[PDB]
Amino acid sequence: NATEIRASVGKMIDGIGRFYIQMCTELKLSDYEGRLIQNSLTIERMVLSAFDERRNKYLEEHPSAGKDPKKTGGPIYRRVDGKWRRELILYDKEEIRRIWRQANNGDDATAGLTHMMIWHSNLNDATYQRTRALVRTGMDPRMCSLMQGSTLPRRSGAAGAAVKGVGTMVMELIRMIKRGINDRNFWRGENGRRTRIAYERMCNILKGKFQTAAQRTMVDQVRESRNPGNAEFEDLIFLARSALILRGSVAHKSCLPACVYGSAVASGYDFEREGYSLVGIDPFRLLQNSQVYSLIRPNENPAHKSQLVWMACHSAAFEDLRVSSFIRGTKVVPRGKLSTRGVQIASNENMETMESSTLELRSRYWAIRTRSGGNTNQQRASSGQISIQPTFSVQRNLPFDRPTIMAAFTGNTEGRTSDMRTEIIRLMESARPEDVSFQGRGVFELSDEKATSPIVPSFDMSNEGSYFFG
Amino acid sequence: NATEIRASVGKMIDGIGRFYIQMCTELKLSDYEGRLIQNSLTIERMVLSAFDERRNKYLEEHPSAGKDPKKTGGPIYRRVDGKWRRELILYDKEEIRRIWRQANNGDDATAGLTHMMIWHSNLNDATYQRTRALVRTGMDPRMCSLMQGSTLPRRSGAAGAAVKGVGTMVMELIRMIKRGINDRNFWRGENGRRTRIAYERMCNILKGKFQTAAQRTMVDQVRESRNPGNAEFEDLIFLARSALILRGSVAHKSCLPACVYGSAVASGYDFEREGYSLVGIDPFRLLQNSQVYSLIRPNENPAHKSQLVWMACHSAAFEDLRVSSFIRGTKVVPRGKLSTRGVQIASNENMETMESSTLELRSRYWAIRTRSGGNTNQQRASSGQISIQPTFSVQRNLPFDRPTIMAAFTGNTEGRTSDMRTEIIRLMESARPEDVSFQGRGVFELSDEKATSPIVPSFDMSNEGSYFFG
């Protein structure tokens, strides 16, 4: 059944929206002030800090960073008769914790929290990619397209586990491997137990994310090493390099800024009644009638800023430029020639140069974001029955496709990773960059509500460049 | 045990002989007509066409060449009161297929078929050498002595795999390499799978045929290339050039014409009882009491024709002229001054000029044809123990010949082919053209049945020329 999940997501988004309304009430902000991305970012990171129990518990035992008992940050921006001002106002954790407490009818709202962490992951992935950590681990910065949800902490649950990508998991595993190489953390203490439990859980998440059998079995053989040394390091690097083409269907949750949700909730559009979806038309239908303001530097182009924020909202920073432009309706500028900077504003930059303006979010078309992979993998490995069932009682043979039956079982168990690298490189060679994917699907029009008739895109515009980076 | 193989070969030759008797019965041919090489060639090539499933299956989908549903060729020659006549009589495939079906007590007679393909290979190798394909592949026609069984199709089994030579395998590999260079046949389709399977099987056959370790390891490193480009092309050319001296013991099966087998079977000499061998005295003992007739042009010398047909029967076209003459008893004329042409007769040449005559096959001596190589290779690399076993329990060292122990294992694996070309050229330099081979063996007399006492040949007849070609 899908009605229950729809009601649950509608309920928790209604809670988030009415929390945002409560914030707009308590901050004494004007109508325009509540349509700002920056203040939503500030309050939302404040919520992240308040609800992150582990960092807090690390902090009350560590009274450092000067003024840090329980209050952090808070750069609220207010419009003064056309000009702008920034104030560093500090808020307690317990008060706003309880404001959430009645902002969700007595619940913890963990799903909402995961929504905020995921929307932060999308903003960071859209703005800045961490080539720095990649090169730190020795890992090639050519594969930044594997950095989905890198800024996410491990505190996120299964819903948060859905969005964090393959390459980010390679990075976090490499971090723990380097730590275990530096010192003997693998002893029989409770620390070793929690490390191996986390390691096996993360490997299970990995094997869930992949699609082809060969990579799944190689990963299953990865955690056989009770004492991970150096071989699994290049094993995981090659895992990422092979997942370049055999990508895992991780997630692309379409999280939206708190201002848009709050404006919708304030207008009386209760999400529980008509339902809410995070994947279909629904996150789209709020945006063509949404007004968003933000601050811009006197050199930044607002036209680029609108495209970038729509990227971040729809987590399309790692999507191809051609289809993103087709859905948007206008050409999208790659990261190479963007005359803009990060949407976050520095704490030291001067107050005079900021100017507020409206953000354009309307898009001509819409499409469903499925958590799947390209059809090319199913082209490499076709589909069909392998077994048969006797319906009539007739004296006949039972046809069994035996050579694939051994392949599923792997009768002769794989010796090491290398034998798997062999046929996975063979599959990579079988791959082609002209393999059309997602057959039977298309882009629909905004007037469509039940996905009745799509239109297939056709891109013949030479080599404009399907690479947002470079 | 050797009795079972002897019985099997005797049985299948008895089947072939009684099939030939059935053909002589159904063709209504006279006594002399069944002693003709030409009619045996015609019926035998007809059998090849009937039992070759792949070409047939290519043909019923390709109804071309005019009159070609299921009937091909058939130039039967009949003697008319001294003169000769040629008739193009066409036979169906299924009828003669079933005639074989009871001609071998319900078996397929695949071994007999391989015997016919091998005897065709010997006739072609004796008559005409394919310098043309060699030059087509850019391959030097100085090495025609490596063309054993070139006309053989790949359908031949392990018994047929025994006779097809090293240079022919170089040629077929070069053909597939050129085809894979022309188009990308190496994709992940089923065609690529069958190509790599055939390629590895043929490389296994090659490594089976060679004798020295260095060439075997270089060949083992040949198929490491998953995408064969151009380097392995000259690698295989150099393989053939090195196998010039370090020849592989491929095979020299002594196949005999169907007329000789049929005459023996008709006389009541059942091969199952007294046994048959294809390698010892036995294929020889049928020939001194065998009568064979054939057609000859008014310019062709019958004396040369008898020597050439005995060459083709004994597959001694690539054997040295001195020993071939010694075993035959008379001088053998090289290909340079043979006033004869191919034993096959053209379809357009006139009926008047043909004249039939007896073929001389009796030879003074006999010798065993072992599938081995010259003793010179064992002179270059001597023989002896490398390890020892403790018989008495005595506190003593275990002598191990370590530097050759690494050599067998190749502890430092060879980088490329070039390091192997180095020491193989060194071995070629160590080679001498005066190295006497086949020590401990000799030529026996026809009166000998158990190989009791041979006589060693001694050739001091200057430089008559041990080269059938040139």
Measured between beta carbons, which residues in chain B are less than 8 angstroms from residue A427?
188
b/e string for A272-307 if b means 16 or more Cβ within 10 A?
eeeebbbebbbbbebbeebebbbbbeeebeeebbbb
For an interface test with B, the pick among A430, A432, A434, A435 (most B C-beta atoms closer than 10 Å) comes out as A430
What is the sign of the dihedral through the CA atoms of A119, A121, A124 and A129? negative
Strand, helix or coil for residue B443: strand
The nearest alpha carbon in chain A to B192 belongs to A430
Among A346, A343, A352, A358, smallest CA distance to A38 is for A343
Strand locations in B281-326 (E): 292-296
| Torsion on CA atoms B306, B311, B313, B316, rounded to nearest 10 | 170
Half-sphere exposure of residue A237, counting CA atoms within 13 Å on the CB side? 15
Among A89, A90, A115, A88, smallest CA distance to A100 is for A115
Neighbours of A109 (CB within 10 A): 22
Chain A contact for B238 (CB, 8 A cutoff):
no
Dihedral pair phi/psi, residue B275, rounded to 5°: 90, 155
CB pairs under 8 A between A and B: 10
Instruction: Give residue numbers after which chain A breaks (C–N above 2.5 Å).
Output: none
Residue B90: DSSP 8-state: -
For an interface test with A, the pick among B185, B186, B188 (most A C-beta atoms closer than 10 Å) comes out as B188
* Method for this entry: cryo-EM
Measured between beta carbons, which residues in chain A are less than 8 angstroms from residue B227?
429
Longest Cα–Cα distance in chain A: 91
Of B186, B188, B226, the CB nearest to A380: B188
CA distance A430 to chain B (A): 5
Strand, helix or coil for residue B80: strand
Q: CA A425 to CA A242: how far, in whole Å?
A: 8
Residue type, B234: E
**If you search the block for the tokens 């430092």, which residue do you land on?**
B412
What is the sign of the dihedral through the CA atoms of A407, A411, A412 and A413? positive
> Is the distance from CB of A257 to CB of A291 less than 8 angstroms?
no
The contacts of residue A132 (CB under 8 Å, 6+ apart) are none
> Is the distance from CB of A293 to CB of A357 less than 8 angstroms?
yes
Cβ-count burial of B449 within 10 angstroms (0-12 exposed, 13-18 middle, 19+ buried)? exposed
**If you search the block for the tokens 């060639």, which residue do you land on?**
B41
Residue positions counted in chain A: 470
Q: What's the token pair of residue A291?
A: 């007004």
CA distance B186 to chain A (A): 9
**If you search the block for the tokens 């060459």, which residue do you land on?**
B311
The nearest alpha carbon in chain A to B224 belongs to A422
Q: Do A427 and B186 touch (CB under 8 A)?
A: no
Residue B84: DSSP 8-state: E
Q: What is the resolution of this structure in A?
A: 8.7
The nearest alpha carbon in chain B to A423 belongs to B188
Strand locations in B206-246 (E): none
Q: CA B294 to CA A202: how far, in whole Å?
A: 83
CA distance B403 to chain A (A): 30
Dihedral pair phi/psi, residue A262, rounded to 5°: -65, -40
The contacts of residue B456 (CB under 8 Å, 6+ apart) are B442, B443
Q: Do B226 and A427 touch (CB under 8 A)?
A: no
Q: What's the token pair of residue B246?
A: 């370090």
User: Parallel, antiparallel, or unpaired for β B444-445 and A75-80?
Assistant: unpaired
Residue type, B44: E
Q: Do A426 and B226 touch (CB under 8 A)?
A: yes
What is the sign of the dihedral through the CA atoms of B412, B415, B416 and B422? negative
Show the 3-state SS of chain A: CCHHHHHHHHHHHHHHHHHHHHHHHHCCCCCCHHHEHHHHHHHHHHHHHHHCHHHHHHHHCCCCCCCCCCCCCCEEEEEECCEEEEEECCCCHHHHHHHHHHHCCCCCCHHHHHHHHHHHHHHHHHHCCCHHHHHHCCCCHHHHHHCCCCCCCCCCCHHHHHHCCHHHHHHHHHHHHHHHHHCCCCCCCHHHHHHHHHHHHHHHHHHHHCCCHHHHHHHHHHCCCCCCCCHHHHHHHHHHHHHCCCCCCCCCCCCCCHHHHHHHHHCCCCHHHHCCCCCCCHHHHCCCCCCEEEEECCCCCHHHHHHHHHHHHHCCCCCCHHHHHHHHCCCCCCHHHCCCCCCCCCCCCCCCCCEEEEECCCCCEECCCCCCCCCHHHHHCCCCCCCCCCCCCCCCCCCCCHHHHHHHHCCCCCCCCHHHHHHHHHHHHHCCCCCCCCCCCCEEECCCCCCCCCECCCCCCCCCCCCCCC
Residue type, B308: L
Measured between beta carbons, which residues in chain B are less than 8 angstroms from residue A380?
188
Distances B239 to B197, B217, B233, B410, B467 between C-alpha atoms, Å: 21, 12, 10, 20, 22
> Is the distance from CB of A290 to CB of A260 less than 8 angstroms?
yes
> Is the distance from CB of A446 to CB of A288 less than 8 angstroms?
yes
The DSSP string of B329-370 is: SS----GGG-----SS--SSS-SSS-EEEEE----SEE----
Q: CA A316 to CA A466: how far, in whole Å?
A: 12
| Torsion on CA atoms A429, A435, A437, A443, rounded to nearest 10 | 150
Strand, helix or coil for residue B137: coil
Measured between beta carbons, which residues in chain B are less than 8 angstroms from residue A378?
none
Strand, helix or coil for residue B78: strand
CA distance B224 to chain A (A): 12
Residue B252: DSSP 8-state: -
Q: Do A380 and B186 touch (CB under 8 A)?
A: no
Cβ-count burial of B309 within 10 angstroms (0-12 exposed, 13-18 middle, 19+ buried)? buried
CA distance A45 to chain B (A): 50
Measured between beta carbons, which residues in chain A are less than 8 angstroms from residue B186?
429
CA distance B234 to chain A (A): 25
Cβ-count burial of A182 within 10 angstroms (0-12 exposed, 13-18 middle, 19+ buried)? exposed
Distances A447 to A273, A365, A366, A444, B261 between C-alpha atoms, Å: 21, 9, 10, 8, 88
Q: Do B186 and A429 touch (CB under 8 A)?
A: yes
The DSSP string of B181-203 is: HHS-TTSSSHHHHHHHHHHHHHH
Q: CA B134 to CA B143: how far, in whole Å?
A: 9
Q: CA A264 to CA A282: how far, in whole Å?
A: 12
Selected residues 154-213 of chain B with any CB under 8 Å from a CB in chain A: 186-188
Residue positions counted in chain B: 470
Strand, helix or coil for residue B97: helix
Selected residues 398-427 of chain A with any CB under 8 Å from a CB in chain B: 426-427
For an interface test with B, the pick among A377, A425, A426, A435 (most B C-beta atoms closer than 10 Å) comes out as A426
> Is the distance from CB of A294 to CB of A309 less than 8 angstroms?
yes
Q: Give Rg (Cα) of chain A.
A: 25
CA distance B187 to chain A (A): 5
Residue B455: DSSP 8-state: B
Neighbours of B409 (CB within 10 A): 9
Measured between beta carbons, which residues in chain B are less than 8 angstroms from residue A430?
187-188
Selected residues 366-405 of chain A with any CB under 8 Å from a CB in chain B: 380
> Is the distance from CB of A23 to CB of A36 less than 8 angstroms?
no
